[PDB]
Write an enzyme that holds these catalytic residues in place. Sequence first.
Site, PDB file in Angstrom:
ATOM      1  CG  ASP A  93      -1.839   1.012   1.291  1.00 25.00           C
ATOM      2  OD1 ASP A  93      -1.787   1.934   0.464  1.00 25.00           O
ATOM      3  OD2 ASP A  93      -2.707   0.976   2.127  1.00 25.00           O
ATOM      4  CB  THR A  94       2.146   3.560  -2.641  1.00 23.91           C
ATOM      5  OG1 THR A  94       0.941   3.572  -3.382  1.00 23.91           O
ATOM      6  CG2 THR A  94       2.957   2.524  -3.216  1.00 23.91           C
ATOM      7  N   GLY A  95      -0.084   4.242  -0.182  1.00 21.44           N
ATOM      8  CA  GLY A  95      -0.823   5.291   0.504  1.00 21.44           C
ATOM      9  C   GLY A  95      -0.691   5.203   2.004  1.00 21.44           C
TER      10      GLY A  95
HETATM   11  C1  0TQ Z   1       0.215   9.044  10.068  1.00 25.88           C
HETATM   12  N1  0TQ Z   1       0.261   7.870   9.228  1.00 25.88           N
HETATM   13  C2  0TQ Z   1      -0.812   7.378   8.577  1.00 25.88           C
HETATM   14  C3  0TQ Z   1      -1.908   8.284   8.181  1.00 25.88           C
HETATM   15  C4  0TQ Z   1      -0.828   5.915   8.279  1.00 25.88           C
HETATM   16  C5  0TQ Z   1       0.247   5.029   8.663  1.00 25.88           C
HETATM   17  O1  0TQ Z   1       1.239   5.522   9.264  1.00 25.88           O
HETATM   18  N2  0TQ Z   1       0.046   3.759   8.352  1.00 25.88           N
HETATM   19  C6  0TQ Z   1      -1.148   3.730   7.706  1.00 25.88           C
HETATM   20  C7  0TQ Z   1      -1.810   2.648   7.176  1.00 25.88           C
HETATM   21  C8  0TQ Z   1      -3.029   2.787   6.565  1.00 25.88           C
HETATM   22  C9  0TQ Z   1      -3.633   4.014   6.513  1.00 25.88           C
HETATM   23  S1  0TQ Z   1      -5.017   4.141   5.776  1.00 25.88           S
HETATM   24  O2  0TQ Z   1      -5.660   2.854   5.627  1.00 25.88           O
HETATM   25  O3  0TQ Z   1      -5.813   5.019   6.547  1.00 25.88           O
HETATM   26  N3  0TQ Z   1      -4.568   4.736   4.408  1.00 25.88           N
HETATM   27  C10 0TQ Z   1      -4.338   6.189   4.258  1.00 25.88           C
HETATM   28  C11 0TQ Z   1      -4.935   6.686   2.947  1.00 25.88           C
HETATM   29  C12 0TQ Z   1      -6.386   7.010   3.265  1.00 25.88           C
HETATM   30  C13 0TQ Z   1      -4.208   7.975   2.622  1.00 25.88           C
HETATM   31  C14 0TQ Z   1      -4.089   3.846   3.324  1.00 25.88           C
HETATM   32  C15 0TQ Z   1      -5.047   3.577   2.190  1.00 25.88           C
HETATM   33  O4  0TQ Z   1      -4.329   2.851   1.204  1.00 25.88           O
HETATM   34  C16 0TQ Z   1      -6.221   2.693   2.553  1.00 25.88           C
HETATM   35  C17 0TQ Z   1      -5.900   1.204   2.839  1.00 25.88           C
HETATM   36  C18 0TQ Z   1      -7.169   0.446   3.182  1.00 25.88           C
HETATM   37  C19 0TQ Z   1      -7.608  -0.642   2.404  1.00 25.88           C
HETATM   38  C20 0TQ Z   1      -8.791  -1.306   2.699  1.00 25.88           C
HETATM   39  C21 0TQ Z   1      -9.574  -0.921   3.788  1.00 25.88           C
HETATM   40  C22 0TQ Z   1      -9.098   0.160   4.555  1.00 25.88           C
HETATM   41  C23 0TQ Z   1      -7.932   0.849   4.279  1.00 25.88           C
HETATM   42  N4  0TQ Z   1      -7.029   2.837   1.381  1.00 25.88           N
HETATM   43  C24 0TQ Z   1      -8.333   3.156   1.474  1.00 25.88           C
HETATM   44  O5  0TQ Z   1      -8.856   3.654   2.458  1.00 25.88           O
HETATM   45  O6  0TQ Z   1      -9.095   2.860   0.287  1.00 25.88           O
HETATM   46  C25 0TQ Z   1     -10.422   3.348   0.135  1.00 25.88           C
HETATM   47  C26 0TQ Z   1     -10.484   3.927  -1.271  1.00 25.88           C
HETATM   48  O7  0TQ Z   1     -10.908   2.867  -2.132  1.00 25.88           O
HETATM   49  C27 0TQ Z   1     -11.198   1.669  -1.370  1.00 25.88           C
HETATM   50  O8  0TQ Z   1     -10.182   0.648  -1.371  1.00 25.88           O
HETATM   51  C28 0TQ Z   1     -10.329  -0.096  -0.169  1.00 25.88           C
HETATM   52  C29 0TQ Z   1     -10.666   0.943   0.874  1.00 25.88           C
HETATM   53  C30 0TQ Z   1     -11.270   2.096   0.072  1.00 25.88           C
HETATM   54  C31 0TQ Z   1      -3.008   5.147   7.024  1.00 25.88           C
HETATM   55  C32 0TQ Z   1      -1.778   4.988   7.636  1.00 25.88           C
END
Ligand code: 0TQ
EC number: 3.4.23.16
Lengths: 99, 99
Positions: A25-27
């Site tokens: 996960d690059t995000g």
């Molecule tokens: C201060 N540091 C932060 C903010 C984070 C960290 O340090 N580790 C992290 C690990 C994960 C996340 S996150 O899940 O909140 N996330 C941040 C993103 C919103 C900028 C990563 C993002 O890739 C998430 C991963 C995910 C997948 C499935 C279920 C929940 C989270 N992507 C995401 O929220 O995707 C949305 C968008 O489309 C859909 O795909 C599956 C979920 C839906 C944040 C952090």
Amino acid sequence: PQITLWQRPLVTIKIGGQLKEALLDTGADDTVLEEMSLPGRWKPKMIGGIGGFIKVRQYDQILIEICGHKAIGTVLVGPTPVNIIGRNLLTQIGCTLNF
Amino acid sequence: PQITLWQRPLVTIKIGGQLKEALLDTGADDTVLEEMSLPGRWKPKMIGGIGGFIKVRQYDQILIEICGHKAIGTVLVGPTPVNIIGRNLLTQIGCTLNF
Ligand SMILES: CN/C(C)=C1\C(=O)Nc2ccc(S(=O)(=O)N(CC(C)C)C[C@@H](O)[C@H](Cc3ccccc3)NC(=O)O[C@H]3CO[C@H]4OCC[C@H]43)cc21
């Protein structure tokens, strides 16, 4: 390997002598894993996401083997809905984005 | 270009005649943007994340230009904390993971 993005980029990891699947996960700045059985000390932390905040346990210098490449780093544990390999570990296995 | 992961992978995008910065996010199925001014019809949707769920507006067939590469697809709009390019658009600009 090269990984295209038509499907979720899931890889098998070995951590804590257990096998799990996790999303590259690059995000994600930091690696966060679903509730799991992990030895030793941890610090309390919160991280935020789409949707709000979770409380996690922060474990440092944890060995994780990610599609066969070893990495040591911080691993957060708590109520994420998906195990996520974040950039703290992705840089260690030499992982890059290309377009 | 090749992008390493020591920093957040942010790129400049043009959407709706506006310029924004967004994270190339392999962990995101769909592109979700912060509240913005976008022409036309949308459908109500929720998506879930770390932390819980947000209500978004779903816009289909939206043109977005992402580091100079055009893509058309679904764009979700609502209270995300960061603009995120998800895999629905990443596959269109030919973006891959490599390690
Ligand atoms: C201060 N540091 C932060 C903010 C984070 C960290 O340090 N580790 C992290 C690990 C994960 C996340 S996150 O899940 O909140 N996330 C941040 C993103 C919103 C900028 C990563 C993002 O890739 C998430 C991963 C995910 C997948 C499935 C279920 C929940 C989270 N992507 C995401 O929220 O995707 C949305 C968008 O489309 C859909 O795909 C599956 C979920 C839906 C944040 C952090």
